[PDB]
Write a protein that binds this ligand. Structure first.
Ligand code: BCL
Ligand code: BCL
Ligand code: BCL
Ligand code: BCL
Ligand SMILES: CC[C@H]1c2cc3[nH]c4c(c3C)C(=O)[C@H](C(=O)OC)c4c3nc(cc4[nH]c(cc(n2)[C@@H]1C)c(C(C)=O)c4C)[C@@H](C)[C@@H]3CCC(=O)OC/C=C(/C)CCC[C@H](C)CCC[C@H](C)CCCC(C)C
Ligand SMILES: CC(C)=CCC/C(C)=C\CC/C(C)=C/CC/C(C)=C\CC/C(C)=C/CC/C(C)=C/CC/C(C)=C/CC/C(C)=C/CC1=C(C)C(=O)c2ccccc2C1=O
Ligand SMILES: COC1=C(OC)C(=O)C(C/C=C(\C)CC/C=C(\C)CC/C=C(\C)CC/C=C(\C)CC/C=C(\C)CC/C=C(\C)CC/C=C(\C)CCC=C(C)C)=C(C)C1=O
Ligand SMILES: CCCCCC/C=C\CCCCCCCCCC(=O)O[C@H](COC(=O)CCCCCCCCCCCCCCC)COP(=O)(O)OC[C@@H](O)CO
Ligand SMILES: CCCCCC/C=C\CCCCCCCCCC(=O)O[C@H](COC(=O)CCCCCCCCCCCCCCC)COP(=O)(O)OC[C@@H](O)CO
Ligand SMILES: CCCCCC/C=C\CCCCCCCCCC(=O)O[C@H](COC(=O)CCCCCCCCCCCCCCC)COP(=O)(O)OC[C@@H](O)CO
Ligand SMILES: COC(C)(C)CCC/C(C)=C/C=C/C(C)=C/C=C/C(C)=C/C=C\C=C(C)\C=C\C=C(C)\C=C\C=C(/C)CCCC(C)(C)OC
Ligand SMILES: [Ca+2]
Ligand SMILES: [Ca+2]
Ligand SMILES: [Ca+2]
Ligand SMILES: [Ca+2]
Ligand SMILES: [Fe+3]
Ligand SMILES: [Mg+2]
Lengths: 43, 272, 70, 84, 257, 66, 318, 72, 42, 41, 73, 42
């Protein structure tokens, strides 16, 4: 059976920070697209 | 991931440039100085091919084309949109190919073996350099080399061939084709023989070296041997590459008529 | 709505290091690809000659015009 | 927020040497690529002729009624073109 | 009209698709046959734990080789014999770092000096006799004149010093050819050297062995019985000579430029 | 090739106007006779095929030279 | 440098080996084995003995009748002069029937000798097939060499018998010469619009290049570990030693994946056979289904489109 | 027809979950790229359709560019 | 078991797998409704 | 393992963030100059 | 922030100095060649600009060459 | 220390490395001033 050696506490910690980082990245993406739509609308 | 037996062979040393700074693995790959170089140049070349497709008329995979300069540029430097992009990419390509060969040399030194594979790769590299460097220099212009595009380098091959009316009668071309054909035949026979000896008729034991010799002596009357067929293989492939390079360095620089007219030296010998 | 409770246990069966590297490399490759695909369309923003054409601006400087007249 | 306070722990399972090497190599590659993409454009600054042109300018060749350059009546070789 | 089109779908198109699918499917089967040796592989995890992984596509089901002369069955993929006892220290603290040998590098069995753990039986002919044997046990062989007989020559060892003298030739009866040279070393032991690591000069009457140094010929592994050689012993001998390509001189593993 | 082509009046064209099988019934031998006459055109003027064709389509007039 | 293992420096002789014993009821082997010093510099020195049974004699009668016919017609084409035969040898040939005869049997000097030589060569190759099969099977080995041979025979029959019959003319087949068969190659490309736009031709070229690549790689790798006993592949397969281990680590480190000592031979087999499979598929569709490969490639979005700048007037439209 | 899919979870006793997850993710990305490229190569293409306006044409007809092309 | 998972572990994995797949398909449906509103293809 | 303890990771992180910030500052300055010289949007 | 870079000298405890030196030198030579070739492909080219004089044209119009070309016809 | 250099050796190397890099960049600036005087490009 495949395991990673992380306990459940370590996995919870990693998950917290992973989700925060992904949310911040997607926020920046949305902002870039709002600027691009204001400048050069494509649809 | 490592194989069952891999860990005891992953030691340090054996390098050419760099030293202990680039001596690591990333996954299964070994990196080194030349690994960094190769990936750098491959990435840059690929991205420039893609950009040259972006400024063209289509992004269809079959119809992309980046062309060399005109013949009036000579051996100079062409504008970016009319040939200079081709020159930058053809510098990246050389960098990547040579890096590949030297990385191979580092790996073989670490594992304790001979340098036969990078040496055989050198002849492919030599054929490429003949087509992009040596022949253009002898004829006096970069615009004698081929464009980068599937389907578009084939138009080059076709028209260059018909610049001599019938390119089949080129002598070094005949010799190279002979080697190519014989190489495919030999590879089929070698593959078949080893498979046949370790996968015998149902309910039999694995056969031996005596069986390998006997079968070909029965069919044909001569058997070359288990170590000499590997030699014969290296030989046929290298010779194919070599005579291709010769046949292209002959066409244009040393012969400008039709290729059938060269052969005329034979029936004009004063001995029949 | 409590259907995604055990989700944090994902990292007990999936390697975090491999996942991180895969994500980063894929994102860089996709960034390069989308920029090149949009530059090859009508939406291209380097060659659209907005807000002005610079090659055309250089061809019509008086210094160049007076020399081309002669 | 305070959710990013434990980000340094990143370096306990991602190592500095390979990471630094990757970053530096990638940044140089990107630098060269963007300079070449902007050079192959309308924004090109080496060849724009501002503030002045320094090399001689191209000269066109007149064509015939077939749209290609005229032949010269005692030349022992035909005339070159690049367009067909 | 030169390029008029009647119908878009034709047979060449369908046949090309069929070929794309017939390739793409021998790749699958060959990649599965590739994994009968060395698998399952060992993936190292985030904090050092190692698991067995198997790749894409998965490993095949085991097949059996039936060896001749009651030489047993070999199942593949199957079990493995245990590694011996190599000692190694990692150089940098990450899974992809390299290793250094701990003791004397020549006598360590790591790096180019590693070897496999094979059977302790000799390789056989089609009749049941041992395959690699000295030329006094195989009484029908002879060196072809026109060729330098190496028996008697000396074994210069890559730093100019003398290693010993050649006293026997070891032949291969299944395919008649030379495989090993036997020599007496400086401390009067009998050691073998593979013929593919020897440059033979007939006029100088020398054999140059570029791999190891002259004093290194005293520590080459020895055989049990000198009328035959087993698979294990072949591996040990060859590996000892291969360790010298990187460990003979302290400057050999040290970045040419 | 001069008897059928430069004194007689035979058809030099051999290729089709569509991509799939149609009413064209020329053979490889007729193609060889055409190839022979073209070899003479090249020799008599000091040029190659590409002085009047693009080899990738020897039959298209929109890809020929003037 | 170090010994490269390209030539044998010291040679040894024992009495000739007659061969593994055959099943009872077999014929003896013919010939007394001789030894070649020059062949022994690069490989095995023994020549012979040879096995001639029922199928390999019928083959060799067929083949030699065919050769006599081909040679004599080439010789009649110069007026029986052997001096002219040697002088113009690469230009001579035996030519197929005129295409107007269709699939009938033409008179002997206008294509019937071509037909005879083709029939006898065919029978020769099928009898040889049976010989190869039985020789490998009587020694107890797998019959893998017969499968590849069957593929090659099928390509010989496709261009030559099957395609000419599907077209309706024997005059669509190659002649027996050197320069004549090169002319056939060029003409069939010219007539059916450019073989570079045939996709099966592109795929077979992919696999011919790949055969050369793969066999350079394999020949190199086994010569580079022959110091650890790597040239003895059967033992490295049934008892993996250090030669196989080093051989597979080299490729794994270099390009990220590897094969084993037995699997690389399956890659070889397939790379040599897909070349000819695509050869058959590309020839069988030319003329019978597709009449112009360039127009096909244009219809399916494959051919590039150079800029024009001019207008040329088709004089048949004027 | 209410209890026929009861033991379905025992799927994961014969299929490895991690391998399956990786396979699914890779297949989904490949299919995403493929469908986007198939739709971009048809009449439904949305980057080159010049809707809501053509931008290269818009740049060619700016008054400054027109006045510079005139004086030439 | 040939995956090493017990029956409890399999039940757990199955629960979360089905939830995730349902959410993914929901997002796909939403994307297609938007595309139909913008550029109908049938 | 990467072998780094928590103290070494803290140290590396400090210097890494400082360096990245300085680099991005220089990039912003280059773009302001380029916009002043040759505006592209 | 006047202090945020002072551990910087520790860089050489994880990066080998000689390897780094060699890498820097090789990269610098490659970049030198590349930038020279990129600028020579533009209007700023300084070998073919015919400044301060065109030399091939100067050779075609020498009085000796002109007198030899005249006496040919 | 993974390169074997102590902290004193690293300090020494760093001193000379920074001096050398500064001198190199000085020479580059001088070359560009000359080029601008001869053939201004912006
Ligand atoms: C007409 C279209 C617009 C345009 C529309 C968009 C849209 C829409 C987007 C971008 C996005 C990007 N564009 Mg843009 N863009 C245009 C022209 C440009 C030009 C140019 C030379 O013309 C350049 C060089 C860029 C460059 C970029 C990148 C900064 C960014 C993608 C980075 C990435 O792939 O992360 C991959 C890297 C990671 C995931 C790394 C993870 C973390 C690492 C360590 C830090 C990375 C820093 C990151 C690059 C910048 C984040 C901001 C920082 C606070 C400074 N664009 C034109 C004008 N561009 C994307 C973006 O904004 O990202 C938010 C995006 O969505
Ligand atoms: C009308 C056209 C003429 C014709 C015109 C030409 C012309 C023109 C040429 C040939 C050349 C060749 N021709 Mg011809 N040829 C014709 C008919 C034939 C026929 C036939 C059955 O009719 C055959 C069998 C051949 C066979 C051949 C070979 C002898 C030779 C090509 C092999 C080669 O160049 O290797 C050499 C190998 C290379 C150049 C490969 C370079 C490899 C590089 C270093 C590695 C690249 C790696 C890559 C970028 C990495 C991708 C990585 C991914 C991750 C996978 N020709 C017709 C008559 N022929 C070519 C030649 O001889 O060139 C030397 C050549 O230029
Ligand atoms: C005319 C047609 C429409 C169009 C019609 C559609 C339709 C229809 C669909 C998409 C979908 C997608 N489109 Mg769209 N799309 C258009 C133009 C674009 C353009 C562009 C440059 O023009 C881009 C870059 C995109 C990109 C995308 C991706 C976000 C998405 C495919 C995801 C995928 O492959 O997951 C594959 C990878 C995995 C499954 C791995 C696992 C994913 C993990 C769990 C997390 C990834 C999150 C993912 C990126 C979604 C983010 C959602 C968050 C809630 C923010 N489209 C045009 C305007 N597009 C698909 C979609 O929406 O999926 C929901 C979809 O069905
Ligand atoms: C119109 C443009 C100008 C021009 C503008 C510039 C500008 C601007 C620069 C150069 C620089 C260089 N130019 Mg210039 N250059 C022109 C024409 C030439 C011609 C020629 C055939 O016409 C040549 C051969 C050169 C050659 C050179 C090199 C001396 C130097 C690059 C050094 C290098 O790569 O170091 C790479 C190698 C290393 C770093 C290895 C370590 C070096 C050690 C310390 C010792 C080497 C000694 C050193 C070369 C002195 N130039 C024309 C006339 N040239 C560069 C320079 O001056 O650097 C100071 C530079 O910035
Ligand atoms: C998978 C495709 C490749 C392949 C495979 C292949 N060919 C094979 C086999 C296999 C697996 C055999 O087992 C079979 C064999 O027994 O060879 C040892 C064979 C064979 N392929 C041969 C040749 C051959 N294969 C070729 C091609 C290919 N073979 C493909 C590239 C070519 C090419 C490319 O032109 C040639 C010339 C023969 C050596 C042999 C079949 C022998 C045979 O049929 O002989 C009986 C018939 C006679 C004519 C007897 C009369 C005397 C002969 C003239 C002697 C043969 C000498 C030789 C052909 C000299 C070359 C002459 C040419 C220059 C004209
Ligand atoms: C590109 C990119 C985005 C990079 C990012 C990734 C990063 C950051 C770094 C990774 C590190 C590095 C340095 C990676 C470099 C690798 C990269 C990226 C690309 C290279 C991959 C590559 C060139 C692959 C081509 C593979 C192909 C098409 C091979 C052709 C031949 C072929 C089909 C061979 C199959 C048969 C095989 C496996 C032959 C090998 C083989 C042979 C030949 C034997 O003789 C032998 C004898 C006995 C035992 C085993 C063997 C054996 O395995
Ligand atoms: C496992 O080992 C093997 C053997 O040993 C047991 C073999 O004998 C064999 C049989 C091989 C042979 C009998 C030799 C085949 C000989 C060939 C193909 C001759 C080609 C060599 C040439 C130099 C001709 C080329 C010359 C010019 C172009 C001029 C194989 C295939 C094998 O795999
Ligand atoms: C090793 C393989 C080649 C060895 C054989 C070399 C022998 C002869 C080669 C010379 C034949 C060249 C072609 C002559 C005919 C074409 C016209 C031509 O170019 O010949 C001359 C050039 O000779 C030149 O390069 C001569 C340059 C030769 C240098 C070769 C050395 C190579 C080493 C580089 C390695 C890095 C005259 O040059 P221009 O007209 O002033 O140039 C104008 C345009 O190029 C640019 O605006
Ligand atoms: C073009 C220019 C640009 C191209 C490349 C330049 C950049 C790439 C460089 C890579 C080149 C690598 C070549 C290495 C090499 O040249 O190897 C040499 C020998 O290889 C060897 O000839 C192997 C020799 C094999 C020859 C095979 C010939 C076959 C002959 C068969 C004849 C029999 C006929 C058939 C039976 C020397 O090696 P060694 O001294 O044994 O090594 C020992 C140590 O030094 C290792 O560190
Ligand atoms: C009264 C009449 C006297 C005849 C007595 C002889 C009996 C007939 C032949 C015997 C026979 O048919 O034997 C076969 C010979 O096949 C062969 O000729 C095969 C050749 C027969 C046909 C020859 C002409 C060929 C026909 C056209 C081609 C057929 C192509 C089919 C290929 C798939 C098999 O041979 P072996 O197994 O090696 O021999 C073992 C013992 O039998 C003898 O030691
Ligand atoms: C002077 O010389 C003497 C006489 C002393 C002998 C010396 C022999 C010499 C020197 C020979 C030289 C030979 C040469 C150079 C030969 C060249 C051969 C080449 C390169 C040939 C290439 C291709 C030919 C092919 C592919 C032919 C294929 C033909 C086929 C498949 C025929 C099929 C016909 C059939 C099956 C028959 C059907 C007939 C029937 C009766 C059914 O029709 C209804
Ligand atoms: Ca703009
Ligand atoms: Ca400027
Ligand atoms: Ca739009
Ligand atoms: Ca000048
Ligand atoms: Fe082999
Ligand atoms: Mg003919």
């Amino acid at each position: 059976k495949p395991s990673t050696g992380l306990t459940e506490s370590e996995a919870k910690e990693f998950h917290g920070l992973f989700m925060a980082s992904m949310t911040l990245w997607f926020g920046l993406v949305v902002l870039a697209h709002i600027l691009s739509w204001m400048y050069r609308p494509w649809l | 991931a490592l194989l069952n037996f891999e860990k005891k062979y992953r030691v340090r040393g054996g390098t050419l440039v760099g030293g202990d700074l680039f001596d690591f693995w990333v996954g299964p790959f070994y990196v080194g100085f030349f690994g960094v170089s190769a990936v750098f140049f491959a990435t840059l070349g690929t991205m420039l091919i893609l950009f040259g497709a972006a400024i063209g008329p289509t992004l269809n995979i079959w119809q992309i084309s980046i062309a060399p300069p005109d013949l009036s540029v000579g051996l100079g430097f062409a504008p970016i949109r009319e040939g200079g992009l081709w020159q930058v990419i053809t510098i990246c390509a050389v960098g990547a190919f040579v890096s590949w060969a030297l990385r191979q040399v580092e790996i073989a030194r670490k594992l304790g073996m001979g340098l036969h594979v990078p040496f055989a790769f050198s002849f492919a590299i030599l054929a490429y350099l003949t087509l992009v460097f040596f022949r253009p220099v002898l004829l006096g212009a970069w615009g004698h080399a081929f464009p980068y595009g599937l389907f578009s380098h084939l138009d080059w091959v076709s028209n260059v061939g018909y610049q001599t009316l019938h390119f089949h009668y080129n002598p070094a071309h005949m010799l190279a084709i002979s080697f190519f054909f014989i190489n495919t035949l030999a590879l089929a026979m070698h593959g078949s023989l080893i498979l046949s000896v370790v996968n015998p008729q149902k309910g039999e034991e694995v056969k031996t070296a005596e069986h390998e010799n006997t079968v070909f002596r029965d069919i044909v009357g001569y058997s070359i041997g288990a170590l000499a067929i590997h030699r014969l293989g290296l030989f046929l492939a290298i010779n194919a590459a070599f005579w291709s390079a010769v046949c292209m360095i002959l066409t244009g620089p040393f012969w400008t008529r039709g290729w059938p007219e060269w052969w005329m030296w034979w029936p004009n010998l004063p001995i029949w | 709505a409590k259907s995604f409770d055990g989700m944090h246990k994902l990292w007990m069966i999936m390697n975090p290091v491999s996942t991180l590297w895969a994500i980063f490399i894929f994102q860089i490759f996709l960034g390069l690809l989308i920029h090149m695909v949009v530059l090859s369309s009508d939406l291209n923003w380097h060659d659209d000659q907005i807000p002005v054409g610079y090659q055309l601006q250089g061809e019509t400087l008086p210094v160049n015009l007076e020399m081309k007249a002669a | 927020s305070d959710k990013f306070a434990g980000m340094y722990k990143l370096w306990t399972f991602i190592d500095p040497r390979r990471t630094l090497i990757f970053i530096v190599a990638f940044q140089i590659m990107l630098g060269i690529l963007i300079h070449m993409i902007v050079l192959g454009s309308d924004l090109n600054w080496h060849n724009d002729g501002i503030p002045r042109f320094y090399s001689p300018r191209p000269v066109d060749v007149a064509v015939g009624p077939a749209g290609i350059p005229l032949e010269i009546p005692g030349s022992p070789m035909p005339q070159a073109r690049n367009y067909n | 009209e030169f390029g008029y089109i009647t119908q878009y779908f034709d047979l060449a198109q369908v046949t090309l698709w069929a070929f794309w699918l017939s390739l793409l499917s021998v790749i699958f089967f060959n990649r599965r046959e590739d994994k009968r040796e060395g698998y399952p592989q060992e993936a190292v995890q985030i904090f050092g734990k190692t698991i067995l992984t198997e790749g894409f596509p998965f490993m095949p089901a085991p097949k059996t080789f039936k060896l001749p002369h009651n030489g047993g069955d070999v199942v593949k993929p199957g079990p493995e014999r245990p590694q011996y006892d190599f000692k190694l220290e990692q150089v940098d603290r990450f899974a992809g770092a390299a290793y250094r040998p701990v003791g004397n590098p020549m006598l360590a069995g790591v790096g180019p000096g590693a070897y496999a753990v094979r059977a302790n039986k000799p390789d056989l002919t089609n009749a049941g006799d041992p395959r690699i044997v000295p030329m006094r046990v195989a009484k029908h062989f002879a060196v072809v004149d026109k060729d330098p007989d190496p028996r008697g020559m000396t074994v210069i060892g890559a730093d100019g010093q003398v290693g010993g003298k050649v006293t026997e030739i070891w032949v291969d009866r299944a395919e008649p050819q030379v495989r090993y040279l036997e020599l007496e070393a400086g401390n009067k032991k009998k050691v073998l050297v593979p013929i593919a690591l020897c440059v033979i000069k007939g006029q100088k009457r020398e054999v140059k062995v570029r791999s190891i140094n002259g004093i290194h010929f005293n520590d080459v592994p020895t055989l049990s019985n000198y009328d035959q050689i087993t698979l294990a012993e072949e591996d040990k001998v060859s590996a000892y000579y291969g360790a010298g390509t990187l460990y003979a001189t302290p400057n050999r593993a040290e970045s040419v430029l | 090739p001069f008897t059928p082509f430069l004194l007689g009046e035979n058809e030099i064209r051999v290729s089709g106007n569509t991509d799939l099988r149609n009413t064209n019934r020329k053979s490889i031998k007729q193609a060889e006779w055409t190839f022979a006459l073209m070899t003479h055109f090249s020799e008599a003027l000091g040029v190659n095929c590409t002085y009047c064709h693009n080899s990738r389509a020897f039959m298209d007039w929109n890809q020929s030279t003037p | 440098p170090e010994y490269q293992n390209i030539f044998n420096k010291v040679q040894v002789r024992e009495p000739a080996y007659p061969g593994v014993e055959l099943p009872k009821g077999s014929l003896p082997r013919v010939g007394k084995p001789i030894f070649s010093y020059w062949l022994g510099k690069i490989g095995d020195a023994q020549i012979g003995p040879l096995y001639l049974g029922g199928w390999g004699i019928a083959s060799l009668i067929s083949g030699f009748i065919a050769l006599e016919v081909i040679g004599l017609n080439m010789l009649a084409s110069v007026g029986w002069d052997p001096r002219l035969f040697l002088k113009e040898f690469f230009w001579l040939g035996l030519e197929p029937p005129p295409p107007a005869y269709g699939l009938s049997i033409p008179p002997l000097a206008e294509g019937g000798w071509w037909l005879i030589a083709g029939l006898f060569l065919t029978m020769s190759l099928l009898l040889w097939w049976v010989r190869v099969y039985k020789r490998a099977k009587d020694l107890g080995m797998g019959t893998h060499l017969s499968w590849a041979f069957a593929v090659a025979i099928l390509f010989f029959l496709t261009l030559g018998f099957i395609r000419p019959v599907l077209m309706g003319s024997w005059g669509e087949a190659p002649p027996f010469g050197i320069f004549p068969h090169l002319d056939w190659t060029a003409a069939i490309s010219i007539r059916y619009g450019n073989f570079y736009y045939n996709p099966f031709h592109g795929l077979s070229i992919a696999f011919m290049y790949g055969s050369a690549v793969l066999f350079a790689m394999h020949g190199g790798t086994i010569l580079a570990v022959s110091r650890y006993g790597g040239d003895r592949e059967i033992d490295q397969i049934t008892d993996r030693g250090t030669a196989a281990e080093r051989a597979m680590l080299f490729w794994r480190w270099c390009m990220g994946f590897n094969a084993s000592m037995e699997s690389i031979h399956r890659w070889a087999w397939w790379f040599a056979v897909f070349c000819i499979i695509n050869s058959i598929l590309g020839i069988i569709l030319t003329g019978t289904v597709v009449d112009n490969w360039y127009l096909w490639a244009v219809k399916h979005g494959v051919a590039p489109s150079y800029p024009s700048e001019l207008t040329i007037d088709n004089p048949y439209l004027t």
